[PDB]
Amino acid sequence: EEEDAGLVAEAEAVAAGWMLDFLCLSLCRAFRDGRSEDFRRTRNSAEAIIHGLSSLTACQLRTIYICQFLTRIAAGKTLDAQFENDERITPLESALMIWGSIEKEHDKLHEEIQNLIKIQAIAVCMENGNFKEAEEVFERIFHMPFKSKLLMIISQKDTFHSFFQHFSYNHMMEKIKSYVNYVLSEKSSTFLMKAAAKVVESKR
Amino acid sequence: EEEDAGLVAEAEAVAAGWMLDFLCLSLCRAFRDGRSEDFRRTRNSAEAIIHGLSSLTACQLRTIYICQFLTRIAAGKTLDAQFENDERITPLESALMIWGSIEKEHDKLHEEIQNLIKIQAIAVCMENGNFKEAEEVFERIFHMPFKSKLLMIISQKDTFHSFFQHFSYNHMMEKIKSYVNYVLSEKSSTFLMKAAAKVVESKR
Numbered sequence A, B: 001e002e003e004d005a006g007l008v009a010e011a012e013a014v015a016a017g018w019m020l021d022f023l024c025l026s027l028c029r030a031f032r033d034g035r036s037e038d039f040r041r042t043r044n045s046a047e048a049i050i051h052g053l054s055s056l057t058a059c060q061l062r063t064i065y066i067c068q069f070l071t072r073i074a075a076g077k078t079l080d081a082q083f084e085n086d087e088r089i090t091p092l093e094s095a096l097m098i099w100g101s102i103e104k105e106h107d108k109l110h111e112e113i114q115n116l117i118k119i120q121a122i123a124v125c126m127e128n129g130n131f132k133e134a135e136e137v138f139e140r141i142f143h144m145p146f147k148s149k150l151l152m153i154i155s156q157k158d159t160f161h162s163f164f165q166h167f168s169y170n171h172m173m174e175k176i177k178s179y180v181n182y183v184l185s186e187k188s189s190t191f192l193m194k195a196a197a198k199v200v201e202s203k204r
């Protein structure tokens, strides 16, 4: 009776762990495929499932961090979004913090994604006329010639600057998409996806 | 490439169908066990998953209706809740509508649950001093001596009436709990629960 409820609670935690892993892989695929509405709906589902979990493995935690990074990148141009308690932190800044916090290899792609997020953290402020906010973002983030080039753009208020087109928002998105693809490779092995795929194939 | 994405979308629909069935059984168990917070968190998860589904089988639809009934019964005393577009409809009234709409057998238990919900739809208005609202609930719902007994209580404003203790809120809850148990029996066969349970047992 008391031990029966304990078995039930354990089974529900195993099932929730599977649902989280499936939702996390489905969210990454949507980001990669540009399916914004699916991303939005899958994120809501993943967040709710997390609220119903208590124990998280290191792999599940790292996986949750990846989904948060993607969510903030997707809201990168939404400066009215507050993802941190400090209301001064921009979405792209919050993503950078996560990117630097994820337990992952620091390969060339990692640094390129990092540097593109820093450039775009400033560019989205300039592109909304928020020149004082770009200066504040710049100080919280800041590569000496790279740093001095950005400050020069902020002070002159040149919003449509050529530098921001060479290291554009699309460029940042594509490199982030390349990373997700590598991740998606590793998560196509999840239990729920594998089982569902077999059913689909069984009916083909 | 185009057919690959189609297979992926099909597999995600099969996985979502499994997640819905698991969440629906977990929600019923919490209601039965009196775990209110788990019910609240599981309901949020189930609602999000539904927003990510397009096709629903008749069994999945009937199952969704059961969960909605339970949600409204749980908010039966929350008269500030609007579950219907008509803001005049009380939560218990909305549950009664669903109870009369579910494709299920109309056994003695079915009618008893129905009659107890009708009594309590009036009793929760009286118990908040909302005597005019009890009269409006009464007209939208209304067994001639049964009907005339309730109107007599409403007009005399007797809120703590003995009739409302014989056919009490707890009594309505217990009979609804008996039904869920029968339902829970049939849903313990779901794929996710079965698989998770095996894992738990494999580690016992």
Ligand SMILES: NC(=S)Nc1ccc(OC(F)(F)F)cc1
Binding pocket: A023, A024, A027, A042, A043, A046, A047, A048, A050, A063, A064, A065, A067, A068, A071, A072, A083
């Ligand atoms: N507001 C935000 S960024 N919250 C959030 C939490 C968790 C999360 O991972 C996921 F649930 F999707 F797996 C994504 C976003």
Ligand SMILES: NC(=S)Nc1ccc(OC(F)(F)F)cc1
Binding pocket: B023, B024, B027, B042, B043, B046, B047, B048, B050, B063, B064, B065, B067, B068, B071, B072, B083
């Ligand atoms: N507001 C309400 S009553 N909405 C709701 C929708 C669906 C539902 O079934 C479930 F998702 F839980 F399976 C429960 C409640």
Ligand SMILES: [Ca+2]
Binding pocket: A079, A080, A081
């Ligand atoms: Ca702002």
Ligand SMILES: [Ca+2]
Binding pocket: B079, B080, B081
């Ligand atoms: Ca009201």
